[PDB]
Design an enzyme around this catalytic site. Structure first.
Site, short mmCIF file in Angstrom:
data_model
loop_
_atom_site.label_atom_id
_atom_site.label_comp_id
_atom_site.label_asym_id
_atom_site.label_seq_id
_atom_site.Cartn_x
_atom_site.Cartn_y
_atom_site.Cartn_z
N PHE A 202 -17.96 -22.99 -22.70
CA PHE A 202 -19.36 -23.38 -22.74
C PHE A 202 -19.76 -23.40 -24.21
O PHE A 202 -19.60 -22.42 -24.93
CB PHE A 202 -20.19 -22.43 -21.85
CG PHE A 202 -21.19 -21.58 -22.58
CD1 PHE A 202 -22.25 -22.16 -23.28
CD2 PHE A 202 -21.10 -20.19 -22.52
CE1 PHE A 202 -23.20 -21.36 -23.91
CE2 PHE A 202 -22.05 -19.39 -23.14
CZ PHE A 202 -23.10 -19.97 -23.84
N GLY B 215 -32.44 -20.75 -26.02
CA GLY B 215 -32.07 -20.20 -24.73
C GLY B 215 -31.17 -21.05 -23.84
O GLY B 215 -30.85 -20.66 -22.71
N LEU C 192 -12.47 -15.82 -20.65
CA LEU C 192 -11.76 -15.24 -21.77
C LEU C 192 -12.61 -15.14 -23.01
O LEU C 192 -13.45 -16.00 -23.27
CB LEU C 192 -10.52 -16.08 -22.10
CG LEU C 192 -9.47 -16.31 -21.00
CD1 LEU C 192 -8.51 -17.41 -21.43
CD2 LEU C 192 -8.70 -15.01 -20.72
N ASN D 28 -13.92 -11.97 -31.72
CA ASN D 28 -15.31 -12.37 -31.57
C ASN D 28 -16.21 -11.23 -31.07
O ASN D 28 -16.83 -11.34 -30.01
CB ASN D 28 -15.42 -13.56 -30.61
CG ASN D 28 -16.64 -14.41 -30.87
OD1 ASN D 28 -17.68 -13.91 -31.30
ND2 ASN D 28 -16.52 -15.70 -30.61
N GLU D 29 -16.29 -10.16 -31.86
CA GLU D 29 -17.10 -9.00 -31.51
C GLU D 29 -18.53 -9.33 -31.10
O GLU D 29 -19.10 -8.68 -30.22
CB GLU D 29 -17.08 -8.00 -32.67
CG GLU D 29 -15.67 -7.53 -33.03
CD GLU D 29 -15.63 -6.34 -33.97
OE1 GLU D 29 -16.18 -5.28 -33.60
OE2 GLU D 29 -15.04 -6.46 -35.07
N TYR E 224 -21.63 -10.28 -23.84
CA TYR E 224 -21.18 -10.16 -22.46
C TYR E 224 -21.17 -8.72 -21.97
O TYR E 224 -21.38 -8.45 -20.79
CB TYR E 224 -19.78 -10.76 -22.31
CG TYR E 224 -19.81 -12.26 -22.35
CD1 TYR E 224 -19.14 -12.98 -23.34
CD2 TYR E 224 -20.52 -12.98 -21.39
CE1 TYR E 224 -19.17 -14.38 -23.36
CE2 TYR E 224 -20.56 -14.36 -21.40
CZ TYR E 224 -19.88 -15.05 -22.39
OH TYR E 224 -19.91 -16.42 -22.37
N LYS E 225 -20.91 -7.79 -22.88
CA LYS E 225 -20.90 -6.37 -22.54
C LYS E 225 -22.31 -6.00 -22.06
O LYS E 225 -22.47 -5.21 -21.14
CB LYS E 225 -20.53 -5.52 -23.76
CG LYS E 225 -19.06 -5.54 -24.13
CD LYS E 225 -18.22 -4.82 -23.10
CE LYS E 225 -16.77 -4.76 -23.52
NZ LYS E 225 -16.63 -4.05 -24.82
N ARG E 226 -23.31 -6.57 -22.71
CA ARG E 226 -24.71 -6.31 -22.38
C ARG E 226 -25.10 -6.90 -21.03
O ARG E 226 -26.11 -6.52 -20.44
CB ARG E 226 -25.64 -6.88 -23.46
CG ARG E 226 -25.74 -6.04 -24.72
CD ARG E 226 -26.98 -6.42 -25.51
NE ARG E 226 -26.94 -7.81 -25.97
CZ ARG E 226 -26.26 -8.23 -27.03
NH1 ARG E 226 -25.58 -7.36 -27.77
NH2 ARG E 226 -26.28 -9.51 -27.37
N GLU F 256 -6.91 -2.92 -17.99
CA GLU F 256 -5.66 -2.99 -17.24
C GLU F 256 -4.44 -3.52 -17.98
O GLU F 256 -3.36 -3.60 -17.42
CB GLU F 256 -5.92 -3.80 -15.97
CG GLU F 256 -6.97 -3.15 -15.07
CD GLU F 256 -7.46 -4.07 -13.98
OE1 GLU F 256 -6.65 -4.89 -13.50
OE2 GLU F 256 -8.64 -3.97 -13.61
#
Lengths: 167, 168
Positions: free
Chosen positions: A92, A102, A126, A131-132, A138-140, A150
């Protein structure tokens, strides 16, 4: 401001355009091989091998070159032996000059809706480890790094080697 | 000794049987919520979301229960913006008592052919970074570690969180 909608055969030219433009801000580079003919045949033919959402802007906020498509997301459905159907976000991208209203965030919302309507337990995708900024983003949103959790590593065997095994 | 062939609707109980056995074999503690009905609708109803190859053995049917399907492979087609359609190997398993017969290597061969006849540029799959053997089995076979080379990590957002983004 802009409307997010499912692509139509008529948007392929724009999508290839955004794909080439995406293949610039990228670093692994490798110029695009796909053609507009491929995007059509593979996404708007017998059985769609990929789906796309497109960010369309009003006749007013068009591209200097004269374009109404300023962003896109490519996805398809995958399968997991344990839980079933999943939504897979392949990529994307959102044009530079339009990357702050937005659009992207709206794209993620629409994908999440596709995920609900299609009975997908989850959405995989992926993220490059370097790309921290994208990782924390995405972590948020509740994403889990399965590779770190894993140990999953992505492997590939190209046409050359597939030809040997096959023959 | 055995035969690899595309699965049929009648093999779904077998496939799930083998998936539940793959799960036990797994180190992760994943419960299989997938049911036979699921494998049927998603695999043999209108549009297949997955494709399976099954390994069938003659009257060497396992014991007890006696089954002719000793292994399977699950795959589906994906897409890459740069090169197009790809073959994606999701999983493959061969019953403990049947490994070391070459089934696992014959399965990879049929997949290569599917990839060949289906116009796929590559075949992608995942390998746990700790499974040194598999990593070797695939390398030297031509496989390349994309996570290593390009740093790709697999991410996931579960339903609960997809729900939030979908509504909120």
């Amino acid at each position: 401001k802009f409307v997010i909608r499912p692509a139509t055969a008529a948007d392929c030219s724009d999508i290839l355009r955004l794909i080439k433009e995406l293949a610039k801000y990228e670093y692994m580079e490798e110029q695009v091989i796909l053609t507009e003919k491929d995007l059509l045949e593979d996404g708007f033919g017998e059985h769609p091998f990929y789906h796309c959402l497109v960010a369309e802007v009003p006749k007013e906020h068009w591209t200097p070159e004269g374009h109404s498509i300023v962003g896109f997301a490519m996805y398809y459905f995958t399968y997991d032996p344990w839980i079933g159907k999943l939504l897979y976000l392949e990529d994307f991208f959102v044009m530079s000059d339009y990357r702050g209203f937005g659009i992207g965030s709206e794209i993620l919302k629409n994908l999440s809706q596709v995920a609900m309507r299609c009975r997908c337990s989850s959405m995989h995708f992926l993220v490059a480890e370097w790309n921290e900024p994208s990782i924390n983003f995405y972590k948020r949103r509740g994403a889990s790094d399965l590779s770190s959790e894993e140990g999953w590593r992505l492997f590939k065997i190209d046409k050359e080697y597939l030809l040997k095994m096959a023959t």
